[model samples]
Structure formats: structure tokens, C-alpha cells
Target chain A: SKNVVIYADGVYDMLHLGHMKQLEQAKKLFENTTLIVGVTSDNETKLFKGQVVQTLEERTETLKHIRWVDEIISPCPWVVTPEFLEKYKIDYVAHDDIYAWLKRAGKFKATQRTEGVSTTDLIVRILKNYEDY
Target chain B: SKNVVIYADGVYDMLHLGHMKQLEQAKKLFENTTLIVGVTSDNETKLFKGQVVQTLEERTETLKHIRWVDEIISPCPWVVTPEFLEKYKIDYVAHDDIYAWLKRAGKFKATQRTEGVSTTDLIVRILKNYEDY
Candidate 1:
């Protein structure tokens, strides 16, 4: 039997519990699989979101330490095309259900996001609890 | 050939880059090894740190997703005794250089902390930024 390779792409700036949950969900989707996480490049992220606190290198380094991530593609393209999948030997592209763009694709599988916790929420919490954090 | 089992214990409240670096360093210490992480219990953490944002269960869940960790002991004791080591079949206790208490023991090996990045430091950053996280 051929090995299964799953690709999960994200900006992953200031990685927290939410990212961990998504990666865990992706890993559980298959049996005896390799979970390749692609961290979006600084340039691409800059275009979409405002200034990122952690640089691409920093973000990549942070994600590299994650146990669920078997392989990493730094500066990965935002769009997951057929060619991108073929080049990396990826069987599936995993993301949260909210990402309708990728969900339209046959290979894209949507995973549940951890309720009430996100990178944005984390930031908001930090802002709220300025002294405690 | 005997596989080395290394035990690393920490509060792991935030589960950031510093913790990852320590775990990675612990994994690198042995050729063929099992890296077991022990997450301190809520009660124990409260005694030392006053309060913990993430519960023991949450912290364990976070650490569980990390690739470097082979096994986890939830609500692990603060001190690593000979009996504890024998019970877990752990060959060595891994910690950072700052933890003089553990380092004093022969079995404890000190790994370097990722400079300027820690759970406490992360909290401080959030406070300083006020807006960004």
C-alpha cells in the first residue's frame, strides 16, 4: 500500500492551541500518514493580513517544533493547485470548515476548528488581560 | 539494544517555542530514544506560580500534539525521585540550565533555553504590545 501524505497550509504566526487542534484533526483523518504543514510566506501573509509579529523564519521555526508536523514547506503558496499537490505527492489538503475556497476542490478536506479559540481570540484575550498575561 | 527513555517535566502553561526547543534538545540527546513529557498538575502549579491560564488537561492536550513528545504523564509531580524514575523507566530527567534544583542531581541534564522566548516572556510581550500579539 502506498503511504498517505496530507498537506495543511496556514500563516501560523504566533502558534497557539488552535493551530495544534487543527493539526491534530488533520493527523487523525488518516491511518499511517505523513502530515506536511506548509507555512505561508511573509510576502503572501503581508498582502492579506497586516504586519506579522513573527517573521516567516520565526514562524517556520515555531511550527517545526510541533510534534504532529512531519514535514514543512516554508514560503508555501496560498493556493493549493493540482500541480502543487502532484509536486509534493500530497493526497489531501486539510483546512477548517470555514475555508470554502479550498473546500470546493476534490482533495480538500475540512476539519473542525477548536471552539472559542483562535489566533485572533488569543490576541484579544491578551489585550483584555493586559496585566495578567 | 536498549532504547533510552528521557523524562522532561514542566508546567507548560503556554506551550510556546521555549518548551519546544527544550523537548527538541532532549530528543537529540539520544540516538534511539523515547521522550516522555510530564505536565505539572494544576494544584502543584498553583503552589508555585499562583495561577495557571491553561489547565493541566489543556496543557497536556497542547503538548500531546507536538511531534517530539513520545508519551505524556498528566499531572506529573514536581520533583523527579529515584522511585519515580524507576516507575516510568526513565533514564534521565531533562531540564534547562536555570533549574538548579534538578541539575544538582546526577540524572538531570540541562538543555539551553531559546534566548528571549519563554512562557513568561510571551506574556510580557502581549502586555507590552497592547494591540499586536
Candidate 2:
């Protein structure tokens, strides 16, 4: 059997079950897969996704427990370039950034979302409830 | 060995790692045990905690995925009374680490909160990072 390495990157801001499931899917995406998760840094994260509640340390430390994540790349590149792939020896990328380059290379795989929750949805829930947290 | 049955209850607002850890701890509290979890209703949750991002249905459904959760009681009693214990045939109760009266009777087993992250912390994270999700 050939060795396999898959990479997944995200804000991973809240560390909820949905987030957990996303990691689990990526880890189990292929047999004997080495799942490397990338968590963005503060400045880059702000540039890409706005503001972050957890700092690099907290988000990174929290992620280490999921059991599916084999390695982590904090301050991951905002864009996936060839160098990024080779640097990590990534076989397939699990997030749907849908980079035209990634798909054409046949190295892109779609990772299904866990259907109901997200960092935004969770935030909105708190807002709607207003005083409920 | 005694057939031990333990009971744990919560609002389970966001279903994050800390919440997962609490459940994991409760489930592993006893050997070969039956762990039953009770999820509080919207009214009680609002009364007890301030707001909840996820509703009763969403919260309950999210919890169904945890391997450690053997059973769930939706709209769980707001307070655990003598009748509540008798009804569920519970030998020990896992409540918020805030002491339980069942503690007086040795029926209480304290469940520790995951050191970081909580429904409130999650909400605050969003609010603090207002623009970011």
C-alpha cells in the first residue's frame, strides 16, 4: 500500500462538534492517511476571515486533542501554492478552497461539512438569545 | 460488581471540546457503567445560564453523536429532586462542579469543566472578535 498524506486548514475558531467532525472526516478520508491540520495565525487570519476569538496558542493547543490531527501548520499560507504542497508532501487537500490550480492537479478532494453548525451560526445563536450565554 | 448507573445533565450550548470532555469524564467515571445525560430545556437554560446559541433540538441532536453518551433526557428536570433520582434509578449524579445535595448523601460525583472554553466564552469570543466569525 502506498503512503498517504492529506492536509486540511481552517480558522478552527470555536472547536465544536461540527469542527471536530470535519477533522474526523479528513483523517478518515483515506486509509493510512496522515492528516495535517493547518490553523491560521492572528494577522493572516484577520486578513482572511476577519477577527479571531482564540489566539494562536489557544486555538492550536485546543486542536491537539482531536485524535485525528497528525500535525499542525499554524500560520498556514493563505493561498495554496506548489511550494506549500511540496513543503508538506501533501497528497490531497481536504478543504474546498476550490483553487483552480489545485483541482487541475487532481490533488483536490471535497470534504463534506457537518450540516448544522458553524462559528457564525453559533455566534448568531448567542446574539439571538442575547442574554442567554 | 455492582451495576452502576450515573446521571449527568447540562444545557450543552455549543457542544465544544470542554463540553465533550465533561461528558467523557462522566461516562468514564465508573467502570462498565451506564451514563445517562439530561439536557435542560430552553426555559430552564435561560433561567440558569443566560443565553444559548443552539436550541433544544439542535443541542440534543448534536449530543447524539458523542460516543460516550449512552442515553439522553431532553427537557430534563430543572432541579434533581428525590423523585427524579428514584425515577431514573440513578446511583450517582454528575452536576456542575458546584456541589450537589446528593453530595450530602454521597450520590454526587463532581464533573470538571474542560479548563478552557465555554458557551459564554464562545459567545464572548464572537463578540470580542465582532467582525470575525
Candidate 3:
């Protein structure tokens, strides 16, 4: 039987409502789903993101605790590889929003793109516009 | 007047009870605080933690909306610097358990270290311990 694997990646530095929503949505999409998360390390994060918010250990420890995720794999270069896809037996790639733009332009295959609040946007809003605190 | 800034960061991918508690605790300790959050960008996070879950925009957006945060500043180089202290005019730094340890050793003076759950540990506990999804 082909395993239904949901492949996705992100910094997942600070788990927020957006992250929660994304995980819950992806979990609801399939049963027996193996959500593989890729956490950015301290080194590579500096090269691209300019900083590391959470330590690698802290990020991994947090991710391993998510109810939706089954396993976690760390891959370098921050890009998907053929071997990764084959190893996980990924049948579907889940994302929050980018898929819609691609689909609208007919630039990419139509896959499940969730319609929900995003963690990134949520973070910004919280930092920029929270009424209380 | 010395400005008391409450700065913190994490893989706040999943906002839960623990996060709220941390925010509240930080708020109580400082006056006119600016919460400098160092969100791990997708690229840099991938290098260290392996895999990026939320995009930089996603993380930043969510952080901006947090009520406990007065102002949000991103930290580069992932370390504390003289510029950071001068820019924010931070009088005291804060943390949870680690600061408690430091306090015990008299290595640092923490304005506050609230004794409570960690969002990371809390989420993991929820995932691993909770029978219900």
C-alpha cells in the first residue's frame, strides 16, 4: 500500500496560531499522514534568514512534540531533493497559499492549498497591531 | 528613566497556553517594554534546524500581532550586541528556566524569570500526552 505522506517545510521557529492552523489543516486532509518538517539550523539560517531565533535543539524538540507530525528529517540546502521525495514516498505536497497563485496562472499542478490564517502574517499582525499588551 | 524592554523569541509556530503565560509574565515585569523577537527566517532556519516550515513573512506577520509585544525588532547575527542594548535601551533581559539557573549562580541579573511551562515543552506535552487531538 502506498503511504499517504504530506511533505512540507518551514523555519517553524516559533510555533504560532498560523503554524497550528497549517498543521491541523494538513492533518485533516488525510489519515495516517506522516508530516515531515524541516527545521532551519543555526548556520544556514544565518546565511539566508540573517539570524537564528530558536536553537536547532529547541526547534527540533518543539516540532517532535506536535501531534500532527509523525517524523522529522533534516536536509541541507533547504531545497527538496528527489531522494527526499522517494524516501518519504510523498504523494501530496501541502502548502498554505502559494499554490493558488500558481494554479491561477496555470503555472503549476493543482494540489491542496489550504485557505486559512498564516503564521507569518499572524506574527506580523501581532507585533504591529495588537490592541492590548 | 530606564526603559525596561522584554525581549523574547522562539519557534512560536503554535501559539498555545504556554505562550500566553510567557507573554503575560514578561509584561508584568517591564514598563513600556518593547519585545524584540528574533524570528528564524525560512532560509537560515533550514540550514541549522533542517527544513523551513513557515516563510519569513508568515512568521513576521504572526509576531507583529501579539498583544504583549509593544515593539518588535528582529535580531541579526543571532546574538546579543552593544547596538541591541543601545538601540532598545534595554535595562534588563528576561528568560524562563535558563535565567533561573543564571540567577542561582549569580551570573546575571534578571528582572523576571517566570516559573511556568515552556511553549515548546507544553506543545510537546500536549501532543504526546493528550489522548484527544
Candidate 4:
């Protein structure tokens, strides 16, 4: 009865260590945690980022294998709205983004981003070391 | 003590789930296991594969975090020599490659690769979806 339902959303493009660490942190934020991860829809993901490497399905599948992830909420709203939060019973929003409503409602919690690593970094490596890969 | 030492070596570039799963299989290959992983140095990695996204140090650091790994032996021979095997006191070699020497010595083992997912696949995704990431 003391379970904490956390909502962590992301594009989760490549699903690297950086993303892994962030999710791990969110799951460990409090005890008796139910970490519900939201994979941003393909349309919304493209709208935010110029493009997405993995489709919503592919991203969701890979995320399924990760240890920290619990239930996955798909067709997830790109922008975390109050109604959505309430519907999911999300006690805290675990993401770096500053959601004004979430902040006002005292549900926004930030997770640490990995230092000097990202999907973008992986892309850049591929581009620069294009000769090798 | 009948502890089995499994010698698994690779470039370990980017260290994705494919690599993680392979290492997991190697660690579980036998009881009383000491899974000594070897990360190929930058020079040999380039010579064998095209190029590595991560330096040896970076690759080693990430490999250290994986749960199944016991010890990491650096400057691991791109081509496993019998001398190296003897020096490491490896009871079995966990790799797909059928090393004539290791095979003749009855010390070679193989681990299954994850279907349709690999370091090359990751690179291709980045190249194709250049706009977003």
C-alpha cells in the first residue's frame, strides 16, 4: 500500500548507459517503487527532436529488457499534463525537464544525467569514425 | 578448487545489450566461474575491426560496471596466442571464433549472439537517422 508510482518519460533513442543510469536513479529514488516509463510516440518524438533513430515499438521493446523499468505506458503524452498524471497516479515525474504544472503540483523530480555521454555523442562518434563503422 | 576461468575478449565498443547478454552467457557457462574479460587495445581493435567508438580506457571502465564480469585483462591479444592462454590460466575460451590452438587444446567455447542487434546496427541507425541525433 506504500508503493510510489513514478513517471519517467523520454525519446530513449539509442538507450545508452546515460539513459540507463537515469532510469536506475529514478527507480532507486524511494522504496516500494513502481517506475512506469513512457516512450514518447513516434509523431511527438519527431516533433521534439528533428528525428528519432528507433521507432516507438523498437524503443519500447529495448526498454522492456532493462532491469529498472516496470510497466510501460505508450502513446504517452509528449507534454506531461495534469490529467494524464492523475490518471496514471504518478506520484513523481522523474525527468530533467521543467514541467511547470508538475512543479506547481509538487510532482516534478529531477534525475541526474550521466556526465559527458549521450545518444548524440554516440551519433557523433559514428559520424567521425565513419571510416571504421 | 575446480574453478573455471572463462576468457572472453572483444573490442567491446559502445557495450550494448548484445555484449551484455553474451558476457552473461559466458559467466553462466559453468559453475564456480571466474569470467575474466579482455578488452582489445585501440591499435589491435583498429587492425581487426574498422575502428572503435571508445578508447581502451573508456571501454574498460564501462565493462567494469557490468555485473557478470570478474576481472578485465587489457592489451588482450586480437589473435589469442597459446602463451597468453597459459599465462591467464584460462580453462575455457568463450568466443565464437574457433581458435585452432584453443580448439586443439579442448578449451574453446561459444556464446550465442542476440539476433538482429549489434554494434554495426547501432552505427547504421545513427547514419540513417542523422537529422535527429
What TM-score goes with each of the models? 0.83, 0.65, 0.40, 0.68
**Candidate 2 chain A — worst ten consecutive residues by lDDT sum?**
A124-133
True contacts kept of 2: 0.33
Residue B2's lDDT in candidate 3: 51
Tens digits of per-residue lDDT for model 3, B5-121: 666655544454455556556666745655555565565566666643456766565555455656655423355554665676665455545355435543333343334345445
RMSD of each: 4.1, 5.7, 18.3, 5.4
Q: lDDT-based ranking, best first? A: 4, 1, 2, 3
User: Candidates ranked by DockQ, best first?
Assistant: 1, 2, 4, 3
Could you tell me the TM-score of candidate 1? 0.83
Best of the candidates, lDDT: 4
**Candidate 4 B-chain TM-score:** 0.85
Residue range B28-108, candidate 2, lDDT tens digits? 887777889999999888887776667898788777767677889997988788788898899999766335468787998
lDDT of 3 at A56: 73
lDDT tens per residue, model 1, B53-109:
777877898888787899999888877777888899888888774345455655777
Q: For each candidate, report its DockQ versus the true two-chain complex.
A: 0.51, 0.26, 0.05, 0.22
Model 4, stretches more than 4 Å misplaced?
Answer: A1-5, A31-34, A65-67, A81-89, A114-116, A123-133, B1-7, B24-36, B47-50, B63-92, B97-107, B114-116, B119-133
Q: Against the unseen true structure, what C-alpha lDDT does each candidate score?
A: 0.79, 0.79, 0.55, 0.81
List per-model TM-scores for chain B.
0.81, 0.83, 0.60, 0.85
* Docking level of model 4: incorrect
Model 1: lDDT of residue A21: 82
Among residues 3 or more apart in sequence or in different chains, the pairs in candidate 2 whose N, CA or C atoms overlap within 3 Å are: A51-B132, A131-B50, A132-B50, A132-B51, A133-B51
